[PDB]
Amino acid sequence: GLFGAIAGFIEGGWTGLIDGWYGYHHQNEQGSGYAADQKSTQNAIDGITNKVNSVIEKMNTQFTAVGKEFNNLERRIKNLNKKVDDGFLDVWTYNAELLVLLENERTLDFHDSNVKNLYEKARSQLRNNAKEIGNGCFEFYHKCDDACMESVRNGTYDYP
Amino acid sequence: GLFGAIAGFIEGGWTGLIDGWYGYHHQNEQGSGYAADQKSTQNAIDGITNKVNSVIEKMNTQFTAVGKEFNNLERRIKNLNKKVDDGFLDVWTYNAELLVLLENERTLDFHDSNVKNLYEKARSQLRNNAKEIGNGCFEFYHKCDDACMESVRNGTYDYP
Amino acid sequence: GLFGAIAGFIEGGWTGLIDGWYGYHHQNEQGSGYAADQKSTQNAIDGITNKVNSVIEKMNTQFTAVGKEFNNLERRIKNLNKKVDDGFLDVWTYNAELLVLLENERTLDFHDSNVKNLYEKARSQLRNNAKEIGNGCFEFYHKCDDACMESVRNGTYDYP
Amino acid sequence: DTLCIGYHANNSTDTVDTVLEKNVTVTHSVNLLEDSHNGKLCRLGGIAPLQLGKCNIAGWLLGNPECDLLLTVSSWSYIVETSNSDNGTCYPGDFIDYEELREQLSSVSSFEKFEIFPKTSSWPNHETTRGVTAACPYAGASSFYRNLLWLVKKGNSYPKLSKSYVNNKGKEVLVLWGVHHPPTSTDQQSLYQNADAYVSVGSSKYDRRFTPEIAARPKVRGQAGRMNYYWTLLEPGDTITFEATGNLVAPRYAFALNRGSGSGIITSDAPVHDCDTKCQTPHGAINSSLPFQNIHPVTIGECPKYVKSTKLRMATGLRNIPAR
Amino acid sequence: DTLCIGYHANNSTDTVDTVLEKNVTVTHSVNLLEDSHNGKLCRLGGIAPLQLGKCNIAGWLLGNPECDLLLTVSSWSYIVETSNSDNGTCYPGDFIDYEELREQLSSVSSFEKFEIFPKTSSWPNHETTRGVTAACPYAGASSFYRNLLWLVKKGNSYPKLSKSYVNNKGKEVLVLWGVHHPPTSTDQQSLYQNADAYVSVGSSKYDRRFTPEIAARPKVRGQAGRMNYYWTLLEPGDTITFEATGNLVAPRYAFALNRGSGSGIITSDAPVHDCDTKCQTPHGAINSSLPFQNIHPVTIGECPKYVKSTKLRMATGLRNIPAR
Amino acid sequence: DTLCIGYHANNSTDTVDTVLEKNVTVTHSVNLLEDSHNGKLCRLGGIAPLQLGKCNIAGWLLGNPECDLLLTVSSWSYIVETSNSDNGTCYPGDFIDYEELREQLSSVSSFEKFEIFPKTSSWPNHETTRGVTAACPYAGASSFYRNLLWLVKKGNSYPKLSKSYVNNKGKEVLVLWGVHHPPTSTDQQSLYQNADAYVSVGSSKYDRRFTPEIAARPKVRGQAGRMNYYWTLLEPGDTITFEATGNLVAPRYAFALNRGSGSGIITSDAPVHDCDTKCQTPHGAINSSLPFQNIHPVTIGECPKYVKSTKLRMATGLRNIPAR
Ligand SMILES: CC(=O)N[C@H]1[C@H](O[C@H]2[C@@H](O)[C@@H](CO)O[C@@H](O[C@H]3[C@H](O)[C@@H](O)[C@H](O)O[C@@H]3CO)[C@@H]2O)O[C@H](CO)[C@@H](O[C@@H]2O[C@H](CO[C@]3(C(=O)O)C[C@H](O)[C@@H](NC(C)=O)[C@H]([C@H](O)[C@H](O)CO)O3)[C@H](O)[C@H](O)[C@H]2O)[C@@H]1O
Ligand SMILES: CC(=O)N[C@@H]1[C@@H](O)[C@H](O)[C@@H](CO)O[C@@H]1O
Ligand SMILES: CC(=O)N[C@@H]1[C@@H](O)[C@H](O)[C@@H](CO)O[C@@H]1O
Ligand SMILES: CC(=O)N[C@@H]1[C@@H](O)[C@H](O)[C@@H](CO)O[C@@H]1O
Secondary structure, three states: OOOOOEOOOEOOOEOOOOOOOEEEOOEEOOEEOOEEOHHHHHHHHHHHHHHHHHHHHHOOOEOOEOOOOOOOOOHHHHHHHHHHHHHHHHHHHHHHHHHHHHHHHHHHHHHHHHHHHHHHHHHHHHHHHEEEEEOOEEEEOOOOOHHHHHHHHOOOOOOO | OOOOOEOOOEOOOEOOOOOOOEEEOOEEOOEEOOEEOHHHHHHHHHHHHHHHHHHHHHOOOEOOEOOOOOOOOOHHHHHHHHHHHHHHHHHHHHHHHHHHHHHHHHHHHHHHHHHHHHHHHHHHHHHHHEEEEEOOEEEEOOOOOHHHHHHHHOOOOOOO | OOOOOEOOOEOOOEOOOOOOOEEEOOEEOOEEOOEEOHHHHHHHHHHHHHHHHHHHHHOOOEOOEOOOOOOOOOHHHHHHHHHHHHHHHHHHHHHHHHHHHHHHHHHHHHHHHHHHHHHHHHHHHHOOOEEEEEOOEEEEOOOOOHHHHHHHHOOOOOOO | OEEEEEEEOOOOOOEEOOOOOOOEEEOOEEEOEEOOOOOOEEEEOOEOOEEOOOEOHHHHHHOOHHHHHHOOOOEOOOEEEOOOOOEOOOOOOOEOOHHHHHHHHOOEEEEEEEOOOOOOOOOOOOEOOOOOEEEEEEOOEEEOOOOEEEOEOOOOOOOOEEEEEEOOOOOOEEEEEEEEEOOOHHHHHHHHOOOOOOEEEEOOOOEEEEOOOOOOOOOEOOEOOEEEEEEEEEOOOOEEEEEEOOOEEEEOOEEEEEEOOOOOEEEOOOOEEEEEEOEEOOOOEEOOOOOEEOOOOOEEEOEOEEOOOOOOEEEOOOEOOOOO | OEEEEEEEOOOOOOEEOOOOOOOEEEOOEEEOEEOOOOOOEEEEOOEOOEEEEOEOHHHHHHOOHHHHHHOOOOEOOOEEEOOOOOEOOOOOOOEOOHHHHHHHHOOEEEEEEEOOOOHHHHOOOOEOOOOOEEEEEEOOEEEOOOOEEEOEOEOOEOOOEEEEEEOOOOOOEEEEEEEEEOOOHHHHHHHHOOOOOOEEEEOOOOEEEEOOOOOOOOOEOOEOOEEEEEEEEEOOOOEEEEEEOOOEEEEOOEEEEEEOOOOOEEEOOOOEEEEEOOEEEOOEEEOOOOOEEOOOOOEEEOEOEEOOOOOOEEEOOOEOOOOO | OEEEEEEEOOOOOOEEOOOOOOOEEEOOEEEOEEOOOOOOEEEEOOEOOEEEEOEOHHHHHHOOHHHHHHOOOOEOOOEEEOOOOOEOOOOOOOEOOHHHHHHHHOOEEEEEEEOOOOOOOOOOOOEOOOOOEEEEEEOOEEEOOOOEEEOEOOOOOOOOEEEEEEOOOOOOEEEEEEEEEOOOHHHHHHHHOOOOOOEEEEOOOOEEEEOOOOOOOOOEOOEOOEEEEEEEEEOOOOEEEEEEOOOEEEEOOEEEEEEOOOOOEEEOOOOEEEEEOOEEOOOOEEOOOOOEEOOOOOEEEOEOEEOOOOOOEEEOOOEOOOOO
């Protein structure tokens, strides 16, 4: 990861999380579970969707394209015609594979960044009220119930 | 943003700051105002100017390019010629729009990175002498006059 | 640097380190020296090696490409032939130079990202057992011998 | 009490490549490359394609006896030639600017065939019933092109003929004709009397003169002689005039062309079906919304862009780390 | 005492697009796409363009009677044809390799028009005063091309003529001529006596022979006959020889070409004005430093690259969050 | 005790460019642009190239007297013409579809020259020993092309000749011939008797008739007459027939062609050397694994992609800061 979060200081993902890409676990005395962060997840979904559509917008549709025949005395223009078809094909194949490779790299970084920003966000909310255990978990000092855990998720909490 | 600073933990910009892209506010007992950080602003300016120039360097000028005529028995080469003009036109339109798209993404992340770096810089300078209020502000413990505020800006300060 | 590490809070490299791209210095009472982090350096090599390999894959080889002759009454197909030759030549030159420029930016950012992550990793490992001196150095409190320094490197250490 | 921050993971096996790493398993992704087709030649815009089958463009437009199946067809989505489209000019000769004509037909979606010079009323002073050859058989009997009329001398007389047609169609009229070159001077005489015959053809733009070239050529389909074919597009309101003292294989049927859309000719050995599509390739129809395809560079209709890729998959989700 | 770290923001309404988000307002940005032009045809290299108006290249080089306004022009920075450039070959016929000649003019900055075959002294044994036609009228009366000379028989005689010219100019010399084809053999005699006349043209590289093709073709501009136009570029030092026993529409004026810089012919109805520019398009001139323009694919001089883009703006500043 | 985290640095001087900054010294980098070549013409697949030297394609195939060095060669990896390949058609005339013939040869890796029409046994009733000209001299004395046979009348009689050759080599056979055109009818008669001679050539696909065009043209190489050259590719099993009443410059040697690989003709003055290569340019061979080269756009074999770039270097290491 380019931002150290995914596959970084947060070694793995949660098959348990099932309502978004980024979320919380929380093991409060009342119980355990998973809750996905909407803010993060929807923003990411909006961007990647826009990214995919952008890629598709740029690529032109292909209409009717049919070959031409040449007689035995027109080998030069026939080869020229083929050099043109082969040329653009090689170019577009290159453009398509390169754009997908580059964006795939960006996309994974984008997620890594989102997780990271979520961590740092939840971290600056808690401060002294909890310690960083690592693996992206925060252990509270003052005990936090479900009513309280929820305040952390929707960025309210507050208590320097 | 990719670095969480701009439109992140520093929710907005200062219509007030007017001598650079990145800067300081400071509300010392003597008064209040805005002072842009040169180091950063200029570096960022040099980078962006270089990016813009590079984009323009790669894009070749266009000299004399006129149409060609063909008789009624040259429909094949006429079409070949049009397939060529349209092909390159689509390729360059593609490159131009795509380069701008990608660089615009890079640029905003560049600025986002810069602000982030500036904050972490002003932060590692203060340490114990102030506390992180969030929103990018630092509140001094030992009180800091105009002469002290400036020391922070020009990375001098020093006092673990 | 986009991440603030290289040419940032860690002003310079170590001509001393010679067994990797990212390493540790350590000035323990027993002695001083340099040790490169394998985990990091090798991951970086694999990635950069794949990057160069990917770039080379995309660029198609070039087989037999020889000119054609045209008599004095074929100036239109001759120019068409040249417009196609210069056309693809310009396109690929643009593709070559542009891919290199962009990937070079990304490569340095990659390293910067790696250094930063290594710092933050060694950092969250020590916590209280040492203080941030800056320049990327940590000053232990409880004194750390060679057998101890090696525990930090191989991410074992552990001692909140 | 603890609160952790993490990311999604699942049992997806989808993989993608990136600049720094190949074969990365991810949670979600979209395939942009279409690689499936139905292996059939379908209709576009509700119009069936024109199956030339055993015939090629030359044979179709000239009316080669072996292409009678095509006679009633005059509307198509696209023209299809197979690997065995060998039925063209059954009488040996050169088809002038044949490729250009094929090119012209690529923007012709339909036409109206009409007997430009009726066979039983256009040539009172010339024989109209002996123009057959074993080179263009039909049912084992010597025959000829359905759309051309081979005229010969009548009672040892071939008077200078002059015939004109005024394009009254309100559109382009493709006119075809031929000039026959006998192998010997004696054949020239038995066929047209005039040792030194000529054929003249003209309009406001077209203007060409033809001279018989007598000589024995290596036989093709039993013929030592040769028959060259010509065509031209007569513009609306314009006039085409034929003048000849022999050797004219006169026009019988002509075509009022209707330009209509980016259509064309393709070479395919795939079969036709009661099937509809928006995208047709020489291997079969594509029904897809994806931006890319590697089925075939040749398409007809609205299709994904042709690309030589084997795989084009974008990661939308994130690195899948089930850590099971 | 407090110290904050922030970023600039203004009242800019500028927006740009990115991969992830569209229409993002930013503090500063630069437009890279040029979309303005003055709607005028200005001069390049400090020279005015050649305005053909009612004439097309053919009319100009042959000297169609209706193109006399151009007889004095001999230098230009580019050629302009209009929607009404129909004055060309007033006498119906085919202009051989017309498109090639046009292509050849692309880099011609000027020429030295000269009377290669002086009318009143080059043909002592042929009629040089009856070569007019109602097809090429001037001031109501029958006339002809100014640069060609239609020779006819003198006193029932048309001797084999032979005229040669040695390219002494130290540059290419464009020579144009015509070959006439009467509609009937009686006109062929009225015109040139010799029933079997021919025309021969030769240089070191050029060699061609023309034979009259008599026939009554559909009338165009009153003519049932036809006239074909030919040309060739004579190299420095080479010699061109014309031989004929009839039907030769002899060269009167020829042109010594001077090569300038990549230029050409454009079609436009825009007005020419006393004005200058480095970049000209059929719609108007461009004055820009921007790398791109969406004005016109056709350009002359030095221009931004043509692109079909609507908008091309790069963000230079940052995301504009006034947070008002 | 202290532990620090840093990054490598060395004395590398390597520099690369980035979007944001130019000339950035890094620790490690790879060059992607090949710019070295051995300045020599090497062999490919172990086969030597065909050095035409003073001759060009025409002079070689026709067998120009000054190209005897090439006579024994029948296999090559590529064809090379120099800046002095001016030996082609010694006798003035036009080489019909010459560029096409050159294009055809680009896909010929070898051939088998054979005397299609043995000189001493194919023409019993014609003179086979006077076909020489001072325009095609050899050792001071007038000579002629080694592959064609200029036939002339035998004792005031040029009977109608007819000669056929059945392609029986199992591959395309390149046949070349010429048609001579005397400057005067007096020459036409001293050479071929018949004043109205003709040459006819036919196969299953080829069919053309040639007529002498007598006229004094500007002398070239001392010749006021012209000789036109022709060729065709006789398909396997096909027959080619020549008919003439004069003016025919008959085939003597023909070539059974072997298609090989993508090969070609290059123009170079670089020397040929005992050497091998997988990649060859007109400037010299290349021995490299790099993806790009800026040596030359023209290449034969397996080469890096041509590019106009001056420098192409990717940083693999990191920004070098020895901070010395
Ligand atoms: C060459 C010519 O003038 N052709 C005319 C043709 O003229 C004939 C007429 O004068 C009779 C009268 O007795 O004599 C013919 O014959 C002599 C014969 O050849 C000779 O062997 C024998 O010993 O004596 C006889 C008697 O002298 C003439 O040939 O008449 C027809 C009917 O009017 C003309 O047709 C119509 O022509 C129109 C065009 O006319 C022009 C033009 O362009 O305006 C007049 C120009 O003066 C003429 N140019 C010349 C001579 O340079 C051209 C030119 O002939 C054509 O372009 C050639 O193709 O013609 C228009 O075409 C209309 O539609 C026709 O019906 C015919 O042109
Ligand atoms: C009129 C005509 O073209 N008939 C021939 C037929 O004789 C031959 O057997 C067949 C082989 O493909 O081709 C054509 O059908
Ligand atoms: C000699 C000539 O070309 N004159 C015609 C003129 O008669 C006609 O009215 C005009 C219409 O476009 O075209 C040309 O000017
Ligand atoms: C038969 C023949 O081609 N001879 C000429 C020779 O006379 C001349 O000096 C040389 C110049 O390049 O060209 C040819 O070799």
